[PDB]
């Protein structure tokens, strides 16, 4: 029995598979052309893909004998679930594991923008730092400001908890209210009253470019936009427009398109902080994700019910 | 009666002094040579300096009539307190008003280092971002980690409150135990068990180079050092050696020397994030510090006790 892992993983979670007599094939590098995936997948009983791998019907048919697709991620939009179901293939993911890490970086971006940390680091690095001054790199004090969360799942709730510790007030909008000690608002009122808007809602036809030109300019002048969820939730070109003078700034860990090309105007805006989708990039988090994917995969191969099934 | 303000301040706090009939001289620019300070302080009854202005006996004797030195800062290591006392000159500062802003920046630096945010921004900006990968820009998850505060005044306590929301454990060291819900440890014990060490103590002959070579290497391999207090508290050169292969990283808002020249080795270490001493650079905070400095100066000139005296 051979298992295909589309990318190298941190930690030694895979050793468990090797200990079980399973043959582990781990693909090295930043890219995996669909052509090479099809070649490597045939004959494999188990598969551990990433969000960068399109696991469609073709891949499944090519993998005559595939029993489980243990996703190295919480999201599974890159896997044709119905195609797998129709083929008796189990599909699992890694829920819960990256919540705190994603929340942490969300906060890191808020602080990075609000207090001009990235900008300040460049200022010192480039030799512009000559002395301390009362008006140098003034940012926004967070105390008393309102953080408006769009989507209140586990990550959104983790972000709210952190925000409260910085003296921020919290409000939120979601498809459904929740028993939380925060005011539930319509998207319209949230954009109107929030000093900082953070996105934490899944991407769907309804949320595709939710933060369009009209909503971005509906936010208060001097507001900050944060997005560590899905790039497509924001109309990138419109964000550039709003950043020239309306919005205080924006912190993005996800973009559209993604990756965001080097010559894109957002990179030329000092009030924009763009990180390369590293929201879950905590070493322990990434190793934990590996352990969970491995557990799910072994579970299915041992004729047991996996702990985090999608199908 | 003339009052000399050594740097321009944000906000209109100074108008209060003008409304009282006081002549207000405010120096513009990033520099104020001592020879220039001496020339302008002569005949002044009040002085509002910054950490950039060394107020020693020479300055005091040149004024010939100075009644109060209302510091626009919380730290006063740049003022000869004993010289002022022997001359009957009052010295005040601005504590409390900058507590939350400084705590925010401290957390910003921790997240910036731990999650490699500044480095990540550069990665995307330079055009190296080509795909998402399980091992790209892996950082340190803060959950479960111990934060050791050396010095537990208002800022240290404010930092602890925020750290707890990120899932961190808090321990601290100070001259004597305080009525706080955290383990009290000796400096030695703290350095040994803390994953993140943050300095929050004033600079004095006893705290000069507190974090020397021996103590920096006494910290855990993989630990993070934060310094938003005073640069001279750390042996900068030893810090460089420790960052090459022992410590995970360091977040510094203060350095020695300050400013730290751009050719300094620390700027070439990606696991070091240096900001230009912007800890209290929250716009509202800086305007409030101005109001507080003004209230203290006016109080002394009015023959009444100032709210935040040091001398």
Automatic annotation (TrEMBL), chains A, B:
User: D-isomer specific 2-hydroxyacid dehydrogenase catalytic domain spans which residues?
Assistant: 3-310
Question: What are the D-isomer specific 2-hydroxyacid dehydrogenase NAD-binding domain coordinates in residue numbering?
Answer: 107-279
Q: Which residues form the signal peptide?
A: none
A molecular-function term among this protein's GO annotations = NAD binding
Alphabetical UniProt keywords: NAD, Oxidoreductase
Give one Pfam hit by family name.
2-Hacid_dh_C
* Tagged with keyword Oxidoreductase: yes
The answer, when asked if Repeat is one of the entry's keywords, is: no
| GO cellular component terms attached to this protein's record | cytosol
Q: Tell me where on the tree of life, at the top rank, the source sits.
A: Bacteria
- Tell me which InterPro entries the record gives: D-isomer_2-hydroxyacid_DH, D-isomer_2_OHA_DH_cat_dom, D-isomer_DH_CS, D-isomer_DH_NAD-bd, NAD(P)-bd_dom_sf
* Entry-linked PANTHER family: 2-HYDROXYACID DEHYDROGENASE-RELATED, GLYOXYLATE REDUCTASE 1
**UniProt record similarity statement:** Belongs to the D-isomer specific 2-hydroxyacid dehydrogenase family.
Protein known as: Glycerate dehydrogenase/glyoxylate reductase
Biological source species: Thermus thermophilus (strain ATCC 27634 / DSM 579 / HB8)
């Amino acid at each position: 029995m051979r298992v295909l892992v589309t990318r190298t993983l941190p930690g030694k979670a895979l050793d468990r598979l090797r200990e079980r007599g399973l043959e582990v094939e781990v693909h090295r590098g930043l890219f995996l052309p669909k052509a090479e995936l099809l070649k490597r997948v045939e004959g494999a009983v188990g598969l551990i893909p990433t969000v960068e791998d399109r696991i469609d019907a073709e891949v499944m048919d090519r993998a005559k004998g595939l029993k489980v697709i243990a996703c190295y991620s919480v999201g599974v939009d890159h896997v044709d679930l119905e195609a797998a179901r129709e083929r008796g293939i189990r599909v699992t993911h890694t829920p819960g594991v990256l919540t705190e890490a994603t929340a942490d970086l969300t906060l890191a971006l808020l602080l990075a923008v609000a207090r001009r940390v990235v900008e300040g680091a460049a200022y010192a690095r480039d030799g512009l730092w000559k002395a301390w001054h009362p008006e140098l790199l003034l940012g926004l004090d967070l105390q008393g400001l309102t953080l408006g969360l769009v989507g209140m799942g586990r990550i959104g709730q983790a972000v709210a908890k952190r925000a409260l510790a910085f003296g921020m007030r919290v409000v939120y909008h979601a498809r459904t209210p929740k028993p939380l000690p925060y005011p539930f608002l319509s998207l319209e009122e949230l954009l109107k009253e929030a000093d900082v808007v953070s996105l934490h809602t899944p991407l769907t036809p309804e949320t595709h470019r939710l933060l369009n030109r009209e909503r971005l300019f509906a936010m208060k002048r001097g507001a900050i936009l944060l997005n560590t969820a899905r790039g497509a939730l924001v109309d990138t070109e419109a964000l550039v427009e709003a950043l020239r003078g309306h919005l205080f700034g924006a912190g993005l860990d996800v973009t559209d398109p993604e990756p965001l090309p080097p010559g894109h105007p957002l990179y030329a805006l000092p009030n924009a902080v763009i990180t390369p989708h590293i929201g879950s990039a905590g070493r322990t988090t990434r190793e934990r994700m590996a352990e969970v994917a491995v557990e799910n995969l072994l579970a299915v191969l041992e004729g047991r019910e996996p702990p985090n099934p999608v199908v």
